[PDB]
Amino acid sequence: MIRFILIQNRAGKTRLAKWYMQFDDDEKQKLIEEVHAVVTVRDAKHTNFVEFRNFKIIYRRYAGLYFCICVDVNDNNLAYLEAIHNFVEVLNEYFHNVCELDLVFNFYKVYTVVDEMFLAGEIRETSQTKVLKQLLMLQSLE
Amino acid sequence: SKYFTTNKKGEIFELKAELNNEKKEKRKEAVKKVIAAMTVGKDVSSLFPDVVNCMQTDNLELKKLVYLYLMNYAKSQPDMAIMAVNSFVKDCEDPNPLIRALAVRTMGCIRVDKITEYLCEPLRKCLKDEDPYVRKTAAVCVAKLHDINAQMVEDQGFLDSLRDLIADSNPMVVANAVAALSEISESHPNSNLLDLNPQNINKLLTALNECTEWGQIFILDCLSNYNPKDDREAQSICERVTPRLSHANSAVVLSAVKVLMKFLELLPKDSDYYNMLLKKLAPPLVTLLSGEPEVQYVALRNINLIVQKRPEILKQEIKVFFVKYNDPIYVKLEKLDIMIRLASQANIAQVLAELKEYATEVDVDFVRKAVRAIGRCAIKVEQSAERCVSTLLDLIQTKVNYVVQEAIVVIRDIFRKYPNKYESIIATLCENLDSLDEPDARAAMIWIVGEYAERIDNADELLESFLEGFHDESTQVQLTLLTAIVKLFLKKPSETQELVQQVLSLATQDSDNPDLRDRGYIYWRLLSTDPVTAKEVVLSEKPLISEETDLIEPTLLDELICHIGSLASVYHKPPNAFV
Amino acid sequence: GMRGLAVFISDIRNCKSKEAEIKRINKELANIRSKFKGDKALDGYSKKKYVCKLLFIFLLGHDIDFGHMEAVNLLSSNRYTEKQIGYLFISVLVNSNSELIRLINNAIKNDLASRNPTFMGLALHCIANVGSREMAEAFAGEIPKILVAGDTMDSVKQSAALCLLRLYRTSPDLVPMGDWTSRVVHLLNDQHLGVVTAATSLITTLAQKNPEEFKTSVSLAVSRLSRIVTSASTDLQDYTYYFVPAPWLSVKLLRLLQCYPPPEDPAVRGRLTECLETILNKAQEPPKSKKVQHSNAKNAVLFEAISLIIHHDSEPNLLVRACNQLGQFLQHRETNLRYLALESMCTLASSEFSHEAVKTHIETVINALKTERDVSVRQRAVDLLYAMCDRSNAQQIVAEMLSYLETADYSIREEIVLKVAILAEKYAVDYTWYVDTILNLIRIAGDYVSEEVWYRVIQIVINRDDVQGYAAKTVFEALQAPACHENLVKVGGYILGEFGNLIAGDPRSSPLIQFNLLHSKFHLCSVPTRALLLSTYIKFVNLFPEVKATIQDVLRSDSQLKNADVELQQRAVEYLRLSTVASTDILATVLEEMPPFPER
Amino acid sequence: IGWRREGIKYRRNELFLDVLESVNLLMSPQGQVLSAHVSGRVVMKSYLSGMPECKFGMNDKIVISIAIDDCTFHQCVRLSRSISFIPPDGEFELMRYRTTKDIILPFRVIPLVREVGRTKLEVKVVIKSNFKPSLLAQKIEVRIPTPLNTSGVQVICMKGKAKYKASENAIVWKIKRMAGMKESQISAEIELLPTNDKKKWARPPISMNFEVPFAPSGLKVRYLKVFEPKLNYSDHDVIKWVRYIGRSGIYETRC
Amino acid sequence: MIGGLFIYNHKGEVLISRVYRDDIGRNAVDAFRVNVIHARQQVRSPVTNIARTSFFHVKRSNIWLAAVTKQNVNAAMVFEFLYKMCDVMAAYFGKISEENIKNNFVLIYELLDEILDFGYPQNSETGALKTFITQQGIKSQ
Numbered sequence A: 001m002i003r004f005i006l007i008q009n010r011a012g013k014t015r016l017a018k019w020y021m022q023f024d025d026d027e028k029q030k031l032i033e034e035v036h037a038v039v040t041v042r043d044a045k046h047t048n049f050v051e052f053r054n055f056k057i058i059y060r061r062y063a064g065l066y067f068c069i070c071v072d073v074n075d076n077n078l079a080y081l082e083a084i085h086n087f088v089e090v091l092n093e094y095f096h097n098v099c100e101l102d103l104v105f106n107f108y109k110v111y112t113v114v115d116e117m118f119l120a121g122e123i124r125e126t127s128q129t130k131v132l133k134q135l136l137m138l139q140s141l142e
Numbered sequence B: 001s002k003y004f005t006t007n008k009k010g011e012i013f014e015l016k017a018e019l020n021n022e023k024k025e026k027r028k029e030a031v032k033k034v035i036a037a038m039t040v041g042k043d044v045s046s047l048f049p050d051v052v053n054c055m056q057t058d059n060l061e062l063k064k065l066v067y068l069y070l071m072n073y074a075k076s077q078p079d080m081a082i083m084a085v086n087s088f089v090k091d092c093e094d095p096n097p098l099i100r101a102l103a104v105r106t107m108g109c110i111r112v113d114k115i116t117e118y119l120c121e122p123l124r125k126c127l128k129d130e131d132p133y134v135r136k137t138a139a140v141c142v143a144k145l146h147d148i149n150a151q152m153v154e155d156q157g158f159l160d161s162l163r164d165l166i167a168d169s170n171p172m173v174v175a176n177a178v179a180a181l182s183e184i185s186e187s188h189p190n191s192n193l194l195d196l197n198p199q200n201i202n203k204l205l206t207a208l209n210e211c212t213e214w215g216q217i218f219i220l221d222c223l224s225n226y227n228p229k230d231d232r233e234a235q236s237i238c239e240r241v242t243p244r245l246s247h248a249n250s251a252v253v254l255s256a257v258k259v260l261m262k263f264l265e266l267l268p269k270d271s272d273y274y275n276m277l278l279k280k281l282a283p284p285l286v287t288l289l290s291g292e293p294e295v296q297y298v299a300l301r302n303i304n305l306i307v308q309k310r311p312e313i314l315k316q317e318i319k320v321f322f323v324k325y326n327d328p329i330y331v332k333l334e335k336l337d338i339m340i341r342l343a344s345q346a347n348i349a350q351v352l353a354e355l356k357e358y359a360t361e362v363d364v365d366f367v368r369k370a371v372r373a374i375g376r377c378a379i380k381v382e383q384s385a386e387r388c389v390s391t392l393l394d395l396i397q398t399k400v401n402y403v404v405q406e407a408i409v410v411i412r413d414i415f416r417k418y419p420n421k422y423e424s425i426i427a428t429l430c431e432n433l434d435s436l437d438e439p440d441a442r443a444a445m446i447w448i449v450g451e452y453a454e455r456i457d458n459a460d461e462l463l464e465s466f467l468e469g470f471h472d473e474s475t476q477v478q479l480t481l482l483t484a485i486v487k488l489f490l491k492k493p494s495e496t497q498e499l500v501q502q503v504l505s506l507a508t509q510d511s512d513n514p515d516l517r518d519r520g521y522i523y524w525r526l527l528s529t530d531p532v533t534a535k536e537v538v539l540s541e542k543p544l545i546s547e548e549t550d551l552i553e554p555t556l557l558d559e560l561i562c563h564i565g566s567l568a569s570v571y572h573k574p575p576n577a578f579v
Numbered sequence C: 001g002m003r004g005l006a007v008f009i010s011d012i013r014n015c016k017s018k019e020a021e022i023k024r025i026n027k028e029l030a031n032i033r034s035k036f037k038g039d040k041a042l043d044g045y046s047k048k049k050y051v052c053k054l055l056f057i058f059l060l061g062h063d064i065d066f067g068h069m070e071a072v073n074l075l076s077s078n079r080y081t082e083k084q085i086g087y088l089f090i091s092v093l094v095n096s097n098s099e100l101i102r103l104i105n106n107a108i109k110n111d112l113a114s115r116n117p118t119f120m121g122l123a124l125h126c127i128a129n130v131g132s133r134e135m136a137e138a139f140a141g142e143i144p145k146i147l148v149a150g151d152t153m154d155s156v157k158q159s160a161a162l163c164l165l166r167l168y169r170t171s172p173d174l175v176p177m178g179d180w181t182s183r184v185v186h187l188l189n190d191q192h193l194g195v196v197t198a199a200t201s202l203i204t205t206l207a208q209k210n211p212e213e214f215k216t217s218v219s220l221a222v223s224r225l226s227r228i229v230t231s232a233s234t235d236l237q238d239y240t241y242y243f244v245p246a247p248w249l250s251v252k253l254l255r256l257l258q259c260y261p262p263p264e265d266p267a268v269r270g271r272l273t274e275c276l277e278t279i280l281n282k283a284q285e286p287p288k289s290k291k292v293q294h295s296n297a298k299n300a301v302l303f304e305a306i307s308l309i310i311h312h313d314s315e316p317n318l319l320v321r322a323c324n325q326l327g328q329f330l331q332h333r334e335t336n337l338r339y340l341a342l343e344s345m346c347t348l349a350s351s352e353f354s355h356e357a358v359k360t361h362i363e364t365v366i367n368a369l370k371t372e373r374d375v376s377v378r379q380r381a382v383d384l385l386y387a388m389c390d391r392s393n394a395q396q397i398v399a400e401m402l403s404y405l406e407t408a409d410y411s412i413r414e415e416i417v418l419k420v421a422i423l424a425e426k427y428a429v430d431y432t433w434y435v436d437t438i439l440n441l442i443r444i445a446g447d448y449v450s451e452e453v454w455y456r457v458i459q460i461v462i463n464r465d466d467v468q469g470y471a472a473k474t475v476f477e478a479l480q481a482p483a484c485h486e487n488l489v490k491v492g493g494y495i496l497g498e499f500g501n502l503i504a505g506d507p508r509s510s511p512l513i514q515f516n517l518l519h520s521k522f523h524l525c526s527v528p529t530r531a532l533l534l535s536t537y538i539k540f541v542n543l544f545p546e547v548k549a550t551i552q553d554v555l556r557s558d559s560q561l562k563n564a565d566v567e568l569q570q571r572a573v574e575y576l577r578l579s580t581v582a583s584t585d586i587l588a589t590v591l592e593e594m595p596p597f598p599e600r
Numbered sequence D: 001i002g003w004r005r006e007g008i009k010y011r012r013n014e015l016f017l018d019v020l021e022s023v024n025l026l027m028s029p030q031g032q033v034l035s036a037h038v039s040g041r042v043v044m045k046s047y048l049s050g051m052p053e054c055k056f057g058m059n060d061k062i063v064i065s066i067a068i069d070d071c072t073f074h075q076c077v078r079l080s081r082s083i084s085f086i087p088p089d090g091e092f093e094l095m096r097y098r099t100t101k102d103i104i105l106p107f108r109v110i111p112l113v114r115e116v117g118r119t120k121l122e123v124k125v126v127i128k129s130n131f132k133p134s135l136l137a138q139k140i141e142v143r144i145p146t147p148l149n150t151s152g153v154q155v156i157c158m159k160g161k162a163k164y165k166a167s168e169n170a171i172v173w174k175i176k177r178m179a180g181m182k183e184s185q186i187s188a189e190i191e192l193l194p195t196n197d198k199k200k201w202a203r204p205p206i207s208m209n210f211e212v213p214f215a216p217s218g219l220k221v222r223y224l225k226v227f228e229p230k231l232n233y234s235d236h237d238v239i240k241w242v243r244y245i246g247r248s249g250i251y252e253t254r255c
Numbered sequence E: 001m002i003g004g005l006f007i008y009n010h011k012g013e014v015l016i017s018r019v020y021r022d023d024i025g026r027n028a029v030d031a032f033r034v035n036v037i038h039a040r041q042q043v044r045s046p047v048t049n050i051a052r053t054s055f056f057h058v059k060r061s062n063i064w065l066a067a068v069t070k071q072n073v074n075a076a077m078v079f080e081f082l083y084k085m086c087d088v089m090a091a092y093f094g095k096i097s098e099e100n101i102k103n104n105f106v107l108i109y110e111l112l113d114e115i116l117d118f119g120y121p122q123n124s125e126t127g128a129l130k131t132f133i134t135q136q137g138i139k140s141q
């Protein structure tokens, strides 16, 4: 299962964090640092997969933000690598060419998008079409 | 794909609005915010045209910010800074010298051959500029220019253009042309730097009087290179340098000392200058251990070589280098080395007291090096030996484990230096056989039973105590124990054979170490062949270890004296170690 | 949106100091209460927003010790945007206060009990995001009900399935295998694949403790997978991603099937084989898009299929086919595929039905390593060559390992040296090969070589001895590089001291040349090596009298005779005076040939 | 005060410092540090007349399920480089700490495991002591777990001694002593009765115990200066021992 | 001379830097990070030689000030230079800490171009620099 999902910038700063496991805030902070240290040190010659504590991390870099899913060792790497991209395509449609600050000012909507596509450590909805239609129905409400 | 690459919104677009906003106070804030982004690795390259247009300004603080931003892309990609070259040259016959220099320094920190063209002549004018902050920055710029590849021959209307500015009415200016000169000179053909020399020394060592903190040093360092001829030439050279208890201790001080020591090949005490100069040099060096901790380390690493060369200089000054508890480990250790390099026949007095101090402290590493130090005290100076061995015996009584073991090892080397002298102590030494974990110490005792086997009767049961766990044992100990027991036998046949079978049989038949196996055989083939010729070959009067421990080969030491300022002076290594 | 939020955030970015940040944060916290305490009650807009700011502050890393009641009242709003923020706040700041937990549970009670699927949605997610024991006790019995009921909407269904799954991971006892099971199973045949996708996750976790209860799924999972993978261009347009139909559900179905042994119904087995054969064929088809997303999606499916094939371990055609497809990935610019391919092959090399298939790609594994850049990938290439190494390979493997080492980085050296030694010991054809390997191992990377290993290579040159001359020359030609490291000087100097005579005949390698070569290492070596070289040196006095005085004056010297080290000075004196005192017969008796070692 | 009562006296003014650290590791079979942390405490045993003011000094290492970097001092400690206090008399805990960075891993465990079909498993494990050769580690144990369906086992090892314990499903290897910068090997041929019948062997990690005379965190004590104002003795009069004991905690290598 | 000047934070991250010679790339920054900042059981010294490259450093609270070359430089100078830079910085914004460094990126780049040309230590005592320096330092307490 997914243990957590992070979106972070080159600088180490977190832009989203969704946890599917019990951690205290100290720990959540430690994990957020640790992930930054591992992922900002790798050029494009490295794989998108790396073992991390007793789990592993799938990651991809879109400009200056790192999308990162931490998952169980036995989970499918490419499945998650592409889940990330499917998610980024949704984000990109939902914010009309998404940029780092979109995730800042609309941070609470970002969680809406996530819970659409991921719940309880598993992929929920993959269809870009359905997700956007729900999201825009959600936006029209009061 | 190009997700987050969006150009038509986000932080880039926002900052672009402010770089274009018509109020220069909001534009200053843009350029800072862009400088802050580069520094966090954000690709602000998109903005470069809008940030270059902020240079079309009266406001000083603004241009200043743009140059900073443009200086960041000099080193990052020198191609990104090829695109504001047309209005650099413009900005160096400017009103305000603050701007003039600011186009020269930024032109010379760029690294590709599109730079040769636009700069060959504007720099020609910044050296003829009537403001010295520009000639300070042109001088350093001429140096920057050589850096980029090729010799060039218009370059030999540039070397000479620099030599002009060594003669100048500003110690900041001249002292930098000097720095330029020696550096550019060390991509080496021989006869570079114009030997219009007798004159230009007078210009350097006047500049040095009025000079800045750091101007002096580029001077001092560029002198030493040259060998005077005869002889009293040397004299006043050295009578000018005298006031170096200057600003930038120790770079100033030590860059002097460098010169003040290549030129100590005089007919010395025909005139007591030699005695004048050497009285001088003690005080300033001493002062550098008040400076700061890092600066010290360097000082001491030079002092170390200096003390080996001209030992007279600091002979009287040992208390200078006594250890402060709060000194970093590395100042402690170099302090210690030098404390023993100066341990006169007379100052062992407190020097020994000053090491009983150290071996009782908590820094376990430094403690150990301190009781070694007492060792090489007993060894350097003969008359301390008796008192060193006393101190050592005291430290061993404390029962502090690490101190004991270090001491035993040191006591072994003392017995070797002063044989047949400290023998009653052996009995008191074996008392502590209970608590010797470390290989070295075990090997020392073992060697000490040695060697003095015929003195002591229990000696067998002692040496036998180790045969139980001959393995588990350091191959150094194994070796030492092999040799130890063939000694025992070579003075007590019948008596020993009880055991000596075991030990040759364990090196020969049981040991995987081929070097150890060798040694068992070699001894087996001596003993079990010739009962007297063996005694000759082993128990011979070995020569006395003379204190070679810390000591540099005298030729190499002169190489390192001809370097005293530098890196090689800290590593105590020639520059062949890094080409 | 909420302007006051956007301002608070813009003020926080414009801040030019962590001081000023913290000031602008304390300012907002005062303002927020204030207004929470204030006599004038607030509009929904304002609660909603101020809660939202509190969440923001929290996410910057600062503490928040109020707001919780205000977040809870938003739950009871009939305004979505208000509920949403209340639900988000409690999902992100979980507080202990059992007064609030009871309220939260009421809100969830209502929202669930509403028939509004947006509100049902928020409710189910809150539960699922928080998973509190108390939440389980309130709702664990209701979730299965909502999941199955004929009337609840697909999106709710999805959200309820994964909700239930979490309730089952944190509170299994509140999730007995009731009566809903088969109706859960039937979800596998839903039209909405998002729903199918949700259920598959649930069922997978449930079928790991409860295989018999869900063993019905196998058949329906095979049916779905096969309809899925054979679907046309214009099928499942929603769930097609870069021309690949339903990659994530495919993976998932394939994974559910790894909960069970092969389907027991022949026809089913067959549909499954057809299925996998198909997946395996698609890997052989060229990409429909040059975008890496297409092949990553396709391969995700492939690899999960490969996993299923391994785990069943029952179709040898498929295992072989899987090997070969893996092997073609080894020659790919995609570091990701190279990596996964080595990974899966390593598994595959421990099953009989595939071991020999894997051996087949030895050459490709080696060529991939020989030119790899990612260290993790090199690492795993080397692990595969160890996995696939036997008698038929040993030598090809060892030779390339050695070859690779000559120009290797450092990252990888240590591991390979260890491996080379180990495979050498196990698979040595003859003594000579072994010695040829070890000596060369030591020449190239002796800094990593064990003592046990160099002890052995010397110790071996006795018993089967006819290698001595080879050893002697090899050690020699090695030593005569300016490069040259310590354990070489050790084995080098031990061997030449003992069998240097067999190469002293050549004038390219005379006693004097041998000696000086050795001595040009001496003063650079650690003291035990010099102890060893000192023994070499006197053996030289014995074998070659042509050079006994060059040697004696290196022994008579100060740096040997007055040596700080006890062993160095002991030997230099013992040996100096051996070459001086006694006979020549004695000298030759004492430093003869040196007997051979015993056995194990 | 209130932790140190008035008018204490001893003929012989001593103090002892025990640095006691526990090192934890998880590591991949390729040697990637997946997680690692040190838990420590300095224990001071002080017999000092009067009310001594103490100034303590150490190196850079400590800064002041998921391990967090932390440091906690005794109630007596005052902060400003250096720590200063009037210590309680006899034994107490001066400080407690945890570090996660730049840990010195006393051993590298390198596993070589080889599933020959479903009937034989070949296991080799090499351990490298990764510290100064002059220092010695003791009470070494390597514990190599075996699968449940293990028919039997034959084990060879050149250093120490080892043996298979079936109640614990484990090969247990022991080494009384081992110096730094050495290497050691064990080999094992394990025989397998094939149940399974689903599920590859889910492989638990190899674990070690050991003890070393240094702080795996790198902590070094540099000074401890005693200044008693009223009384007769000075820092020069105070006898001082330091000990470092580094123990293994959960020190694991996946195979 | 001074061929590379980097300032790290308590985790070996390059907070801000300026190269002055192309003779040193990334390979420099890493060596110093790996062997000095994240050093294990090594004999620390203010000067280290790895990859045939020399490294000077001082430490301020939690900040690493480094200085770097492949030349045979006046060692003594570097440290003298470095203590004055710290004399300069602290007189523009007080405590020399990761935060205060971070607040004053614009300013610090500016002291650097001024205090050091192509690596040569220049007139760098506070009062002289009030002319050549445009920025003020964001002091916090």
Ligand SMILES: O=P(O)(O)O[C@H]1[C@@H](OP(=O)(O)O)[C@@H](OP(=O)(O)O)[C@@H](OP(=O)(O)O)[C@@H](OP(=O)(O)O)[C@H]1OP(=O)(O)O
Residues within 6 Å of the ligand: C002, C003, C004, C005, C007, C031
């Ligand atoms: O930012 P201010 O100028 O102080 O205005 C704030 C406030 O914004 P914040 O509390 O978030 O800073 C309100 O919300 P927004 O609508 O700007 O989001 C609000 O204005 P509304 O009442 O229109 O919501 C309110 O009251 P006021 O209307 O009196 O300006 C209040 O100002 P006070 O602190 O003076 O109440």
